Design a protein around this ligand. Structure first.
Ligand SMILES: CCCCCCCCCCCCCCCCCC(=O)OC[C@H](COP(=O)([O-])OCC(O)COP(=O)([O-])OC[C@@H](COC(=O)CCCCCCCCCCCCCCCCC)OC(=O)CCCCCCCCCCCCCCCCC)OC(=O)CCCCCCCCCCCCCCCCC
Ligand SMILES: CCCCCCCCCCCCCCCCCC(=O)OC[C@H](COP(=O)([O-])OCC(O)COP(=O)([O-])OC[C@@H](COC(=O)CCCCCCCCCCCCCCCCC)OC(=O)CCCCCCCCCCCCCCCCC)OC(=O)CCCCCCCCCCCCCCCCC
Ligand SMILES: CCCCCCCCCCCCCCCCCC(=O)OC[C@H](COP(=O)([O-])OCC(O)COP(=O)([O-])OC[C@@H](COC(=O)CCCCCCCCCCCCCCCCC)OC(=O)CCCCCCCCCCCCCCCCC)OC(=O)CCCCCCCCCCCCCCCCC
Ligand SMILES: CCCCCCCCCCCCCCCCCC(=O)OC[C@H](COP(=O)([O-])OCC(O)COP(=O)([O-])OC[C@@H](COC(=O)CCCCCCCCCCCCCCCCC)OC(=O)CCCCCCCCCCCCCCCCC)OC(=O)CCCCCCCCCCCCCCCCC
Ligand SMILES: CCCCCCCCCCCCCCCCCC(=O)OC[C@H](COP(=O)([O-])OCC[N+](C)(C)C)OC(=O)CCCCCCCCCCCCCCCCC
Ligand SMILES: COC1=C(OC)C(=O)C(C/C=C(\C)CC/C=C(\C)CC/C=C(\C)CC/C=C(\C)CC/C=C(\C)CC/C=C(\C)CC/C=C(\C)CCC=C(C)C)=C(C)C1=O
Ligand SMILES: CCCCCCCCCCCCCCCCCC(=O)OC[C@H](COP(=O)(O)OCCN)OC(=O)CCCCCCCCCCCCCCCCC
Ligand SMILES: CCCCCCCCCCCCCCCCCC(=O)OC[C@H](COP(=O)(O)OCCN)OC(=O)CCCCCCCCCCCCCCCCC
Lengths: 206, 51, 346
């Protein structure tokens, strides 16, 4: 006996209200305990008042009783279950004994792995995309426009586009309205997008 | 429907429409043919069978 | 260098993608001052109306408990006039207006500011519907958890102020007003008097704010096809979406608030231990695992719905009007949309 394992004596053990009246350690495997039977005096009187004219039953005046929690599933005993399942190799006859207690019963165990089970879609998708960097390392990164005339003019074409917009043809096209207004300004060696362009500023070249 | 001399810059217009053309939420396929452009369209007559 | 942990700063090289949009870009309007101002304004405006409605309904119930309820339109009109001129009604309106000023400025304003801070930059798809709302889910959850406990101190101060008025003169503190009670409680009972056993209020606030803000933001964009293709009334659609959002918030929030009744108000069996040991968290867990929903959904409207839902609905409408749910949308084939213009028309 050890008081450290006794909830009554050890106040550090947090009682689970949802498991009141259920002791998994006391299960039989097979379970052969009766815990439910006829219950009266709660709403239906146990005595007889069918013909009592001076007594009228009022079910609304139900007295509150002890909460009956749903039965808790059995919890495994590691050592006992391992010993029960253990069989000696070349010392035991291959047979099934008459006793039904030899049946291998399933008992719920640790619940920590089920957290990972529940989070598996998040973990699996993170491994698939973020961990493996699929399809590439830039798709999931915060988008940044290229710097001014970077990497090459043939790709960026910021200066030529700026000159075209500032030219007569660019102004005429903007007046037509088919072409939207310019979205960046070429500052003193740097390209700055307008706040209405809805894009981040280009990353620094370092 | 007249072929007039262009006072603008055709290359500049082409580049501008390539880069920053104006689109809309409800734009018809006729005005949005991004992936439906070819050359030498096949011309057939109407109201007659062809094998 | 400064302490045991070192915040190592590292430099990186240039990187860019074909598309510069539909990701995360902080809006210029998303700032501490502007977001806080808009959130406080919307929260105060909503809370004033919510508390005025609550006071009016409670005074109507108080008058009806002593006088017969209206039988026709004329009787209803005179009943409402009498409620308006009731002495208790005016004091209740004043105190609850102060309470609304305190709440909408420190709780609803904080919720709106945090939501804007954490979700302003989620751009939407041009000529389409925003996908990948799973990306926004963490932001809304973070904001809800951060701003959940900002109302429990004010709510406990209100409860203490109202419960002090009903004690004898000897045992009555004598609070001049709700503001005076709030200013005095921290120095009399201590700061923890305004936070002890705050799990019900905290979980209620979380399940309200998260499922209101996120659901409204999701719906206002996903159901937009109604007025974008069906040519329906955008304002009517937004009103319906806000109503759905507030109803869902009330449904998801009331069960956790029911824990107060179960633990303290339900009669205790003589000689037996408390069914929940006085733990609101355990009571909430029991509610979560309970088979029958109606048992803890009883009293949903007479107790919580008309005290919480109208305020949330008004808050959603005001936030939408001011622009706390407005996102930035730009064409992905435009000048700033993408860095590859050679295949936007070819
Ligand atoms: C304040 C803010 C919050 C802070 C959070 C801090 C913690 C992190 C967050 C955790 C989640 C919190 C939210 C609640 C979730 C609900 C469950 C819960 O937490 O309930 C409380 C939980 C109750 O646990 P339970 O499982 O219900 O019952 C335990 C009883 O002892 C059962 O007694 P018994 O006698 O019946 O059985 C004995 C033994 C029986 O043991 C066996 O059966 C042995 C199994 C074969 C041997 C290999 C075991 C070790 C490898 C792990 C399993 C791999 C296979 C499964 C694949 C998925 C693994 C995740 O029990 C076990 O099964 C123990 C092993 C369980 C493994 C399952 C995974 C545990 C980790 C969960 C995620 C958190 C860590 C993430 C990083 C590491 C991931 C691995 O108690 C805890 O607080 C435990 C937390 C998890 C374990 C600690 C992990 C630390 C890792 C650090 C690095 C490695 C150091 C050690 C290695 C050696 C040195 C290098
Ligand atoms: C931003 C993060 C975003 C993350 C997003 C994540 C999204 C995905 C996951 C979402 C779900 C997450 C669930 C987490 C685990 C929940 C476990 C649970 O339910 O049981 C816990 C706990 C159960 O405890 P219990 O033993 O069963 O007692 C039951 C009692 O009825 C209630 O317990 P009690 O009455 O014994 O104590 C109530 C608590 C009341 O405390 C509070 O209200 C503080 C907020 C956190 C309380 C959380 C409980 C305590 C946890 C340990 C200590 C936390 C320290 C503060 C937070 C940082 C560290 C986490 O009292 C204290 O702990 C000490 C109060 C001291 C007096 C007040 C002084 C305040 C500071 C004033 C000066 C500094 C500020 C102003 C000046 C600044 C400089 C100028 O339940 C709660 O307290 C509420 C849980 C609600 C769960 C629903 C979701 C909302 C969660 C909100 C928590 C965080 C609020 C914001 C602060 C942190 C971010 C800044
Ligand atoms: C589409 C069908 C096609 C095939 C047709 C086949 C032939 C006809 C159908 C078969 C008969 C079904 C009879 C159902 C009504 C039963 C009586 C009644 O009024 O219900 C109260 C009754 C509880 O009353 P009680 O037992 O006195 O409560 C005492 C205790 O609290 C014990 O309560 P507890 O522990 O059971 O917990 C109850 C709690 C926990 O249970 C729940 O929360 C149920 C969650 C159900 C989710 C799935 C339904 C759809 C959710 C909305 C999705 C948006 C689009 C919806 C419309 C398009 C899709 C259908 O729920 C509540 O708090 C009340 C539930 C709401 C009742 C709704 C009243 C109208 C019922 C008549 C039909 C309405 C049809 C319109 C659509 C459904 C409107 C709700 O609820 C039930 O017994 C559960 C079923 C409730 C209705 C849902 C099932 C029918 C619809 C099936 C849809 C299948 C597609 C799902 C995917 C949709 C994806 C968009
Ligand atoms: C896409 C197609 C979709 C098709 C399906 C959906 C369409 C409907 C299908 C058919 C079912 C509905 C029709 C039959 C039932 C109708 C309702 C009914 O008879 O019960 C009345 C009942 C009122 O209480 P009561 O039963 O008369 O008891 C009075 C007692 O004296 C005192 O009450 P208490 O405090 O003791 O509490 C009693 C309470 C006990 O507490 C509860 O049981 C509450 C929880 C109920 C179950 C909740 C989950 C299931 C429903 C949601 C999921 C399925 C629908 C999804 C809809 C998607 C969007 C279309 O009793 C109930 O409410 C239970 C029965 C009625 C509700 C549940 C069964 C009907 C289904 C829900 C109908 C309402 C849907 C609203 C919108 C939902 C949006 C997601 O419920 C309502 O009146 C609620 C609905 C109306 C809310 C209006 C205001 C909402 C917005 C807030 C406004 C704030 C002020 C500002 C206004 C500004 C204006 C400009
Ligand atoms: C939901 C998260 C918790 C899950 C707990 C249960 C599962 C066990 C933990 C799985 C990993 C959790 C994510 C963080 C660590 C990722 C490490 C990794 O390989 O990623 C590199 C990868 C990419 O690394 P890489 O590409 O540079 O290289 C990886 C290695 N090679 C070279 C082989 C490819 O990065 C990511 O995928 C980004 C992950 C971001 C996660 C942000 C949220 C979590 C951060 C806070 C955690 C706080 C609690 C501590 C962690 C949980 C408890 C222990
Ligand atoms: C509505 O979305 C959700 C949240 O807010 C965003 C949540 O916070 C949460 C988290 C909340 C929890 C875990 C607590 C839940 C409540 C508990 C435990 C207390 C008990 C509650 C009950 C018994 C009631 C159960 C009710 C339900 C199952 C029904 C819930 C209804 C949901 C999810 C939505 C129903 C459908 C709609 C509103 C349709 C909306 C769609 C349109 C208008 C058209 C959109 C069109 C397109 C094309 C997308 C969830 C699960 C959620 O689904
Ligand atoms: C059913 C489940 C899957 C659901 C669909 C998910 C699709 C995307 C893949 C995500 C998988 C994990 C779940 C994360 C959901 C929330 C974050 C998210 O969705 O990230 C998207 C967003 C970046 O995307 P965005 O840049 O907007 O994309 C378009 C850009 N032009 O990023 C953000 O908003 C920033 C988020 C930062 C924190 C993310 C943490 C993720 C952790 C995942 C598990 C990692 C496990 C690693 C294991 C290592 C083992 C050694
Ligand atoms: C979007 C498709 C993918 C999502 C899933 C679809 C499931 C379909 C199941 C069949 C029953 C639902 C009805 C069909 C879907 C909704 C209507 C739709 O697809 O939108 C198209 C339609 C207008 O299309 P059309 O007339 O061709 O426009 C040409 C403009 N020159 O639009 C309209 O006329 C608007 C009609 C909107 C009806 C929405 C009903 C479902 C949403 C939940 C209930 C909303 C209740 C509140 C509605 C308030 C309206 C003010």
């Amino acid at each position: 006996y050890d008081w450290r394992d006794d909830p009554k004596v050890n106040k550090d053990i947090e009682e689970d209200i949802r498991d009141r009246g259920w002791h998994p350690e006391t299960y039989d495997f097979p379970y052969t305990k009766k815990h439910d039977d006829w219950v009266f005096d709660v709403t239906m009187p146990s005595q007889n008042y069918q013909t009592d004219l001076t007594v009228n039953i009022h079910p609304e005046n139900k007295k509150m009783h002890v909460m009956k929690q749903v039965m808790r599933q059995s919890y495994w005993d590691a050592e006992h279950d391992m010993a029960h399942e253990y069989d000696y190799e070349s010392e035991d006859l291959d047979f099934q004994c008459e006793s039904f207690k030899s049946q291998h019963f399933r008992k719920k165990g640790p619940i920590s792995q089920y957290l990972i089970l529940g989070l598996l879609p998040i973990l699996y998708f993170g491994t698939e995309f973020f961990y493996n960097h699929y399809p590439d390392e830039d798709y999931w990164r915060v988008a940044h426009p290229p710097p001014l005339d970077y990497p090459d003019t043939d790709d960026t074409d910021d200066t030529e586009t700026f000159k075209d917009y500032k030219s007569f043809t660019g102004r005429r096209m903007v007046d037509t309205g088919i072409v939207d207004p310019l979205w960046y300004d070429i500052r003193e060696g740097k390209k700055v997008y307008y706040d209405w362009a809805g894009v981040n500023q280009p990353m620094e070249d370092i | 429907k007249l072929l007039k001399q262009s006072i603008y810059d055709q290359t500049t217009q082409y580049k501008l429409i390539k880069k920053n053309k104006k689109r809309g939420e409800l734009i018809p396929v006729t005005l949005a043919r991004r992936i439906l452009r070819t050359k030498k369209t096949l011309v057939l007559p109407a109201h007659v069978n062809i094998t | 260098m400064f302490f045991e942990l070192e915040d190592i700063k590292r430099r990186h090289s240039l990187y860019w993608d074909i598309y510069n949009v539909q990701g995360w870009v902080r809006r210029p309007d998303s700032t501490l001052y502007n977001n806080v101002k808009r959130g406080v304004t919307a929260g105060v405006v909503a809370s004033l109306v919510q508390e005025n409605i609550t006071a009016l309904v409670e005074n109507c119930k108080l008058l009806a408990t002593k006088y017969e309820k209206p039988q026709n339109l004329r009787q209803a009109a005179t009943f409402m006039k009498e409620v308006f001129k009731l002495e208790n009604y005016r004091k209740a309106v004043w105190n609850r207006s102060q309470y609304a000023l305190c709440i909408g400025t420190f709780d609803i304003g904080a919720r709106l500011a945090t939501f804007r801070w954490l979700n302003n930059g989620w751009q939407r798809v041009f000529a389409g519907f925003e996908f990948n709302f799973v990306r926004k889910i963490p932001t809304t959850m973070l904001a809800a958890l951060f701003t959940a406990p900002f109302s429990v101190p004010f709510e406990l101060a209100r409860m203490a102020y109202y419960g002090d008025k009903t004690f004898p003169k000897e045992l009555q503190r004598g609070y001049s007003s709700y503001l005076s009670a709030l200013a005095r409680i921290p120095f009399e009972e201590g700061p923890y008097f305004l936070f002890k056993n705050s799990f019900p209020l905290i979980i209620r606030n979380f399940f309200q704010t998260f499922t209101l803000f996120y659901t409204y933001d999701f719906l206002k964009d996903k159901a937009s096809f109604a007025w974008r293709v069906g040519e329906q009334n955008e304002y009517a659609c937004k009103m319906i979406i806000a109503g759905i959002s507030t109803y869902l918030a009330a449904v998801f929030s009331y069960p956790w608030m029911v824990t107060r009744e179960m633990v303290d108000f339900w009669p205790k069996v003589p000689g037996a231990p408390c069914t929940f040991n006085g733990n609101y968290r355990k009571a909430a867990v029991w509610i979560w695992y309970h088979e029958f929903s109606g048992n803890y959904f009883a009293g949903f409207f007479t107790k919580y719905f008309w005290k919480a839902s109208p305020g949330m609905f008004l808050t959603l409408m005001l936030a939408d009007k001011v622009g706390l749910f407005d996102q930035t949308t730009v064409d992905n084939f435009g000048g700033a949309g993408n860095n590859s213009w050679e295949d936007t028309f070819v």
